[PDB]
Amino acid sequence: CSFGIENTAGGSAVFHNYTRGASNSVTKNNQLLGGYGSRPWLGSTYTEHSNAALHFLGAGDTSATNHGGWIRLLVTPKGKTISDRVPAFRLSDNGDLWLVPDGAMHSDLGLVRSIETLNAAVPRFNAPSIQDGRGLKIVAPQAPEIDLIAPRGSGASAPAIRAMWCDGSLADTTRYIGATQPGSTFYIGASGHDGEKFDSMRGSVAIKSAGGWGPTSTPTQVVLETCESGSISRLPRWGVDHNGTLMPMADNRYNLGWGSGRVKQVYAVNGTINT
Amino acid sequence: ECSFGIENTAGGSAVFHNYTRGASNSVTKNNQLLGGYGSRPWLGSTYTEHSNAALHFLGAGDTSATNHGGWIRLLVTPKGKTISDRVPAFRLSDNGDLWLVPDGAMHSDLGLVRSIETLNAAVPRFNAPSIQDGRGLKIVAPQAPEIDLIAPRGSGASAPAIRAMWCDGSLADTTRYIGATQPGSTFYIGASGHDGEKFDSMRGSVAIKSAGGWGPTSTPTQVVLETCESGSISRLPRWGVDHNGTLMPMADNRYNLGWGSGRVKQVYAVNGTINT
Amino acid sequence: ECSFGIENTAGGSAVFHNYTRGASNSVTKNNQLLGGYGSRPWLGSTYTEHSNAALHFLGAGDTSATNHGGWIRLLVTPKGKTISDRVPAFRLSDNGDLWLVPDGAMHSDLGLVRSIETLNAAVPRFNAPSIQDGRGLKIVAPQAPEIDLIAPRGSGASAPAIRAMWCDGSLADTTRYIGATQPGSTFYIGASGHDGEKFDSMRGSVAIKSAGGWGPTSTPTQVVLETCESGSISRLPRWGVDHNGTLMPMADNRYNLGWGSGRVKQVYAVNGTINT
């Protein structure tokens, strides 16, 4: 039944896995340093490996200068055997979470833990490794999604994605935090492979701070950005300004409607177009 | 302090296993606890009756020669509550989805829910589309499920982002061809909802679309806004910013700019005459 | 090759426990390590002094008859760094929130932060709204916290998405009534920020909104763009795409299309006369 370590003194009760490389050498990159897993009963035997598991793995070869280590969680899909178990959750050594559900990556790529390592594993991929260390990556066939299920209860269904801007840093000892600075952006858009590589977003919606903030003044804009056919340059086209003006983002450049996409009727207090 | 451990000196792996069976040597069952690791804290003169924080390995379907299904959950106990009210907040499904279900999101009865399919079975009125299973992250929260992206500037700029990354090909097979973004690529940010019978497709959205195929010197895009009319169930493109930067209605001679009691104050255009 | 394990042949669960106490048989404390599992790699002639990758169970509040609070963190060590600089990158809070805090996001001192409330206590100048605790995912990163949605086409189409899912009712109680999307349903995608005193509500946003209540034959929506003016702290609806697809200002006789040095090039409309 139950089983356990007890520390009565007030210290910690910790379980360790100790591993070495071949012939007392340093433990290696992507070596399984430790594991915990369930093995289910088939009727007369257990499965040959874990069907669900926690794995601790080496990140780079160990040395006096590298103690690199990362984590994955493995699951087995219903109707599949342990041959087809999936390392669906990967907490990278950089601190990124990769979520890779069933059907997203082949077995061969089970040790992929970053853009850098994905690039090495799939030479044609060429994603920007500058994105490593930024947060969550989801890889799924065709349609990777985030679903935000929001039952009303007695309030209102109000799911949200919220950027939170600030000046300063939480990384140092001082930890100064201050007012949103000018140049603050929140981009929601799409990058893609161009046949050679992934790069910057090429179409987007962005919330931007309209200058610096203070307690009585927090100005924003919402900007829509696209890229033209024959071009690789994402540009601001139309925006809602801080004062609420819907405006083109350059003077005398962008049209409202076209020949075969004409506005039905325009409603404006002033009947004359200001030129 | 009271450390404890397995050691493999040879170079092999040091792994801890949990072995479980069904009743009377039968196959282990669906949602059966196959293994667990958990802390039990000291109350003064006893420990808690169960773990207050735990990792659980669970069966997905009854085990057979054809099914070795298994999934994971992580359990926490909220401050000011007892283990009676512990929360399986993190659920890594057998399909590979992560479900995040914070305190107050789901009743105890739904602690074994690991998919839309299983949620549909547990709550018959729910009827979400199970086609969404296997797609990634699901967050269930009372009223306001959120993602917060906290972005301290440092010496650069506060630049939080949500980034779709389009490509041709597949990472799933042995060949693993990857290529240029294809026409018909989309990134939808919108809302589905229950219509009193079921959840379905998004009914209002902003979308980034590829404007055809991409190549090294040409990566065209559009931003489209889509809504659904009263008395209708059909989400339609209404207004978009085209690749060349034109703000346009998405159909000819259909949509107005402004209305009788929502009039633009003044229109600024270089050409003072409306092109009909 | 090595292995090690518990076996329950009877059909019961094989569970591993960690038992911990406070000092002198007292209650176990807030943020006390209640249990841990960790790898310790070989340096050539010794192991590392602590785990380089680990699962930790931790107290949330001091334990009592009324509090059994516990939470979870996962720790990793970045390549090219020693265990001195290991990162508690994954934090599943006692409230059930997931915090994702990659390398370089937070100092060592903040390793035990598990909520906005605790972050606020640790960094007094921070002042984020604790009303956001319990809502789901938080990502903290230097400058650019991101979510990447990598979408290989295969034989279909690259269609990454962020999907709100509105419903009436609750999954939290025993009844678990679920029903039609209600009026006042919203999906906000926008930015809050520090104003020099605190974080507060979003100050610029895009929102998908239900245009009233839904039924099986009627699921109306709008897309609204909201900004805040210089010298003001009030986020206001400015322009929206209505359910019938009208692009409209959100107040009558208030907002302009274009300005003096930001003029529309040419306006295309079927009717050449502006309806006043």
Explain what you see.
The structure is a homotrimer. Chain A has 275 residues and is mostly beta strands. The first copy, chain A, has one domain (1-275). Chain A contains 1 helix and 16 strands. Chain A has one helix at 115-121; strands spanning 2-7, 13-19, 32-39, 52-58, 69-75, 86-91, 97-99, 135-139, 145-151, 160-168, 177-178, 185-192, 203-209, 220-227, 234-240, 246-248. In chain A, a hairpin with a 5-residue loop joins β6 (86-91) and β7 (97-99). The longest helix of chain A has 7 residues, at 115-121. The first copy, chain A, is elongated and about 85 Å long. Chains in contact: A-B, A-C, B-C. Chains A and B meet through β1, β2, β3, β4 and β6 of A and β1, β2, β3, β4 and β5 of B.
Terminal CA distance of chain A: 83 Å
Order of adjacent strands in the largest pleated sheet of chain A: 3-4-5-6-7-8
Count of helical regions of chain A: 1
The overall number of domains of chain A is: 1
User: Biggest interface, and residues per chain?
Assistant: A-B, 163 and 156 residues
Number of extended strands of chain A: 16
Give the proportion of residues in helices of chain A. Answer: under 10%
How would you describe the oligomerization state of the chains in this entry? homotrimer
Order of helices and strands of chain A: EEEEEEEHEEEEEEEEE
Q: What characterizes the major β-sheet of chain A?
A: 6 strands, mixed
Find the structural class of chain A using helix and strand composition. mainly beta
The Cα radius of gyration of chain A reads 26 Å
The portion of residues forming beta strands of chain A comes to: 35-45%
Shape of chain A: elongated
